[PDB]
């Protein structure tokens, strides 16, 4: 086509989606990870995770307001990944890399899994 | 912080949100523009438009499944802007620039208004 493109549009949209998350506006699901609860937008979760994409395209699960993750999932690892989904920034540290990679594998977040594998290979 | 960032994350999220729109997945509102209807995600509309942000943060309007725009709004202008919201690409043409600018002013989409004003100033 003969379209023009606004370079910062995608970044600005995500920044606004994160502002809505911070103020709990139009969040439509609670993700339960052991004793912790995380409110989010189903569409953003689906856009970032192969697991949430499969869950919310399911004709029965699409209507659930609560999703319980596998008990092996670490709440901090999930929190770091949820922040990444809404900001593009990943808080990857020596103390959390194993939990973050395990959570990204479960959530089916391929680019996160790839950087974790590379950072782990560098430290061996 | 000591975060790393995935450059293409925001673009990939928006691309996925547009795939959900194309398949009518988890769309939660219909925007009526004269005889035309446009299905969309309230969160994406809010993230792109000052008008939709004000509408869906209203305690009564946040619950509406149908929003009727002002009858002066052109459906093609709206369609072009809705496409821009979900893709960052604006189909700006000599034949549609006036309708697109009028719609962007009504929707409170400042960057679109700015490029329309510049393209109009160049042709005078």
């Amino acid at each position: 086509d003969s379209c023009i493109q606004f370079t910062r549009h995608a970044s600005d949209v995500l920044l606004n989606l994160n502002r809505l998350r911070s103020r709990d506006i139009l969040t439509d699901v609670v993700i339960v990870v052991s004793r912790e609860q995380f409110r989010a937008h189903k569409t953003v979760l689906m856009a970032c995770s192969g697991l949430f994409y499969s869950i919310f395209t399911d004709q029965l699960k699409c209507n659930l307001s609560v999703i319980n993750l596998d008990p092996e999932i670490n709440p901090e690892g999930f929190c770091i990944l949820l922040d990444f989904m809404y900001t593009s920034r990943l808080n990857l540290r020596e103390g959390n890399i194993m939990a973050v990679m395990a959570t990204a594998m479960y959530l089916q977040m391929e680019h996160v899994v790839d950087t974790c594998r590379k950072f782990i290979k560098a430290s061996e | 912080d000591s975060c790393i960032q995935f450059t293409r994350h925001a673009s990939d999220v928006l691309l996925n949100l547009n795939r959900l729109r194309s398949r009518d997945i988890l769309t939660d509102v219909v925007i009526v523009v004269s005889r035309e209807q446009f299905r969309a995600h309230k969160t994406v509309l809010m993230a792109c438009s000052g008008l939709f942000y004000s509408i869906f943060t209203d305690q009564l309007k946040c619950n509406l499944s149908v929003i009727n725009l002002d009858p002066e709004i052109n459906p093609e202008g709206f369609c072009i802007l809705l496409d821009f919201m979900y893709t960052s690409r604006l189909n700006l043409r000599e034949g549609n620039i006036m309708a697109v600018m009028a719609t962007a002013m009504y929707l409170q989409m400042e960057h679109v208004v700015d490029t329309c004003r510049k393209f109009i100033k160049a042709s005078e």
Binding site: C3, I4, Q5, T7 | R89, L90, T115
Partner: peptide
């Protein structure tokens, strides 16, 4: 704004 750019030419994509």
């Amino acid at each position: 704004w750019v030419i994509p």
